[PDB]
Each structure stands twice: as structure tokens, then as C-alpha cells.
Amino acid sequence: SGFRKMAFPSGKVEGCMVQVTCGTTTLNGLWLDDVVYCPRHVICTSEDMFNPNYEDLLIRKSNHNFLVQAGNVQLRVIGHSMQNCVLKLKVDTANPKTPKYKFVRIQPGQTFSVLACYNGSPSGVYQCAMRPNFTIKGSFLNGSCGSVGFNIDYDCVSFCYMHHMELPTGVHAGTDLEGNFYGPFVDRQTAQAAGTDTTITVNVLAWLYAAVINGDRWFLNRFTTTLNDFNLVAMKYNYEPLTQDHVDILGPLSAQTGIAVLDMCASLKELLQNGMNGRTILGSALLEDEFTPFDVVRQCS
Amino acid sequence: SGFRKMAFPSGKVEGCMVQVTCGTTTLNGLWLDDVVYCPRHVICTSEDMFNPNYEDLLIRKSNHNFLVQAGNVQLRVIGHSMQNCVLKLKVDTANPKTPKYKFVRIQPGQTFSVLACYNGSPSGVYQCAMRPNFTIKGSFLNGSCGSVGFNIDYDCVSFCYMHHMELPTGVHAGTDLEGNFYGPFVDRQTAQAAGTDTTITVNVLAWLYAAVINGDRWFLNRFTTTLNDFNLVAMKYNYEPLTQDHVDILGPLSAQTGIAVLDMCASLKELLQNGMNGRTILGSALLEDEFTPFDVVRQCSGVIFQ
């Protein structure tokens, strides 16, 4: 029993965190085999941050300019290649603590753990959700650039995110492990607009199934609705339209509780129109959407 | 920028997690040096749990009856003892991944990170707080007994909690790493219940300091209430009694935000009576009491303009 926001054990990822130093700019790096992945703006100083020419800034840099440090040991760079917004640095040692990794790009609505690092040392770990506008409700202080987002499938660490820049609107922009940014963001410290943040419909429906499993069920009603009728209300409260693919994902959650997918939608519809009237679901008065259907299965099986 | 509930990196604790099997029972063990610590009920059957006599039951058990697995590798048991509700199993190999450690007994209200484990394998990590009634609102299932709670004091892992059982309300109870339970609980299959839970005062205060730092300040007001005046309102809405030493802990946050400790209490008093009216603080309709001032300082950093 109990429903908690849970991060994946960060241990495997911890053995990959190094401190990358280029002149005055120092950030975090991901040491996988003999390659150190870090945001390309490590070559840039507090000067270039407004409008930097990355392709021209790399020209005035050599292997001796980069100072990769694996804790106490000072690794030596033997090659530099800038792919998209990430800088790949080849080193002498092919990391002994390398886990069975893979690089994937997470879709909006999906979740991952973030291991926050400061000066190459892991600080903490928390669970994040990629918002539909491609932003993350995170916590990044000065020196967290290079921190990675990941998922764990038994022994395989799937890397999906790397922190690059702090959004002025409080939010946080970053790239996948191949250097491609999420959303309409670039690695320049300029006024960037995040956009409109819609509530993930399928993640709230998955969270409602977890409340039923935990005994909390004061929100259950006799009403029932169809896909087209429920979607009308979704476009009024900033919610995503539920497709047939979303219903197929909510399979094991519907079979475990017993409540049908179309019947649960009516319980959600009444809580948005009327409200919660001071009562709480799973220890919270707000509809939580940072929990994918796979996150609910992982914790209730 | 930003403010999230954050667990400690669990890496150093994952290297100590083992699977402990005694007869039919399987739970988690904490392998520190050449000793494995686990809940002593692993030696009981479901039948023994109705009225266990752990001393006599441990007399009938020997080293061969304890299968300790460090993943797929097996550790030979060369000794067994009992210290309160924890079973200590001596093994033929010291753990190479043993970090700097100490056993501490946290007070209620304090926080720690939990590494939930199933059959010796870590599944996830979350940030917990010891509730006033000595229970924790965690997320444990069958196979989680022996999952540990900890804090990381820069290089030293302070182990403070071991999971033993779950109560009828879905809340969890456990011991410290010395075997002493937290609360009036016992490792016995009998009727037990958590009791009356209250809201942590010093923790809700610190959370309001963190919201001011992160922009949110619509809940602030020109009111100013005294130490004993606020304590009268606190016992009405189920809150902890605020002491002078509790206010001294809120010192760096008061000096950083420039909001006196009694001024934040006055703003909190209005939030208890009037409410939030739908408007949220840090994206939360309820007041959060799982963040101690120490966790807020650690995340918000801050500068005191002396």
C-alpha cells in the first residue's frame, strides 16, 4: 500500500558523472565507455551566452583545453566532436563502471528520473515528467548543467535527457543524449517562450486507478460517457484529447481494478465541473498528471 | 531555479542491498562490512507470527538455514545474533562496496530517503518524513521488508530506518538500525493501529519560506503574532507545538528572505482560518509538511545580507 512519486535507483548513473572543465566554464559530464557527453556551451564563457557561434568557437579549442575529472583522477581528452548541441569527448580510460546503457528520446507525457549534480558530484534524485510544451518542473541551481534524465529497465539505463539551460520563466530546457533539444529551444541565453501547458489526460486517469487500488474511492459515480463526448470537456480545461491508443495502454489498470476505461472518465468529468470541496484523493487536493500508466503498474504489482 | 522534493543519490546504499532467505521467507538485508542486518521476523513462519518467541526460534535456527544472496553470488553465514527487532548475520566476506556509515535515531518530523527493495534488488527511491505518530507514508509492497531509510552527510551514509511492517491504514512502521521500533509497535501478528496524526509546524513554516524564494508570495500579510498566540491556533487545526529552539532553526531562512519567524507564523495563521480559495502555493492546494528547514536551505541555497 501507499502511493509515492518514486525515482529509479540512481547508482548506475552515479558511476558515470564527471566534472568537465573548459577554461572558466565547468559543468557535469556523462562518462559512458571512453566518451564524455556534455552540453556544447562548456566552450562558451559568461561572454558568449547571448549569441554564440558554436561552430566557430570549437575551432579555437584543442584536446588540452578540456579538463575531464573523474572525482580525484584527471582524465585526458584524445578527441573532440560536437554533435548537434552536445560535445562528445574521447578519453583514455573506458569507464569501468559503465552500465548497459541506451539512448532514447522520450515523448511528451512520459516520465524519467533526474540525478542533479554540482561540480561533478551527485546531489539528489527526483522524478520528472516531460510536459506537453516540452518543459520540466525541476530544480536546477547554478552548476547543474550536464545532469542527466534516465529510465531503468531492470539492468538497462535508458538515457533520455541532459540539462543545458535554465528557462527564464522558471522552467528548464535541455536536449536528448544525441544533442537535439526538446521543444522550440536553442542553447542561447535569450527570452524563450515555453508555450501553453496542457494537462496530460491519460496520466490523470492512471492516477485515478491507483487511488481505487489504495482504497480511496469517494469520487466514484454512476454516470458514463463516450470518447467524443468526454473530449468536449477536455478542450475547456486545458486537457489533451484521449485517443484509442491511450485506451489500449490503460488495459492492465482497468483489468486489475475492474472499472472500465469509459466509466472512469465520468468520475474525472464531475471533479473538474464541481470540484473536490476540501476533500483529498491519495493525500492530495489537486489532479496529479506526472504519473504514466506504466509508473502505476510498476508500483502496484 | 525551481523547488522539488528530492531524495539522496542511492548509489552507496544499492551496493549494500542483499536478499535474505530463511526457510520460506524472503526479505532484504543490509550488508555492512562482514555483517548482514535484516528484520528478525524472517526466522518466523506465518504460524509463528501469531505469538513469536524469537529467542527460542533463533536457538532452533543455524547458519545453514540462512541464504544470503548478493545478487546471484552467495555469502556463507558463519554466525547469527539478535539485537532487539534486528537479526545480525555474520558472513565470510566483508562487503567491498561498504561506504562510510553510522546508525542514527531520527526524531519525528525529520526526513530521510528510502530505497525500496524487492528480493535484494533496489526498485526505487523516495523522500520520506517520520510522521508525528512514528509511522511513514511510504509505498511498500510484499518483498520490501528490510528496505532502509538514510541521509548522506557529504561522505557518510547515516542509516536511520529499516522497514518491518504495514498497518491497516496503509502506513508503514519500522525500527532504527539497532532494532528499536519507532512508536508503540511490535513485530507480532496482532491488532495494531498508527493513532492520531498531526501536521508538522516547523516544516510547514520552512515550505512557505521556499515558496517566497521561488516567487509565490500572495499569502503574505502585514499581521504579526507572538509565540504563545500562534500556539493556541495550532492546537485547533492539529499542529505541533512551536518552541524557541524550533524558531532558532528557522534563523537562516528568516535572515535570507527578510521575513521574521513570527511574521511567517502570522501569515500561516491566516492560511489555516481563511484557506487558499483554489489558488496554489508552489503548485499545491494543501500545506506541505514533509520539508524540514534544513532541506529548504539545502535546495534554496540563499545569501544573508548581514
Residue numbers in the entry:
A (entry chain B): 1 to 301
B (entry chain A): 1 to 306
Task: Give the authors' words.
The crystal structures of the Mpro mutants with the greatest reductions in susceptibility to nirmatrelvir were determined in the presence or absence of nirmatrelvir, including S144A, A173V, A173V+T304I, T21I+S144A+T304I, T21I+T304I, and L50F+T304I. The T21I+T304I and the L50F+T304I double-mutant Mpro apo crystal structures showed that the enzyme C terminus was bound at the catalytic site, presumably preventing nirmatrelvir from binding. (B) (1 and 2) X-ray structure of T304I/L50F double-mutant apo Mpro enzyme electron density of at the catalytic site. The C terminus is colored in pink. L50F and T304I are labeled in purple. The T304I mutation alone reduced nirmatrelvir susceptibility by 3.4-fold, while addition of T21I, L50F, or T135I each slightly further reduced nirmatrelvir sensitivity, resulting in 3.8- to 7.9-fold reduced susceptibilities. The double-mutant enzymes T21I+T304I, L50F+T304I, and T135I+T304I either had no impact on Ki or had a lower fold change, consistent with the lower fold resistance of the corresponding mutant viruses against nirmatrelvir in culture.
Severe acute respiratory syndrome coronavirus 2 (SARS-CoV-2) encodes a main protease (Mpro, nsp5, 3CLpro) that is essential for virus replication. Mpro cleaves coronavirus polyprotein 1a and 1ab at 11 junctions with a conserved Gln residue at the P1 site, a feature with no known human analogs. The essential function in coronavirus replication, together with the absence of closely related homologs in humans, identifies Mpro as an attractive antiviral drug target. The SARS-CoV-2 Mpro inhibitor, nirmatrelvir, was found and developed as the oral COVID-19 treatment Paxlovid (nirmatrelvir/ritonavir).
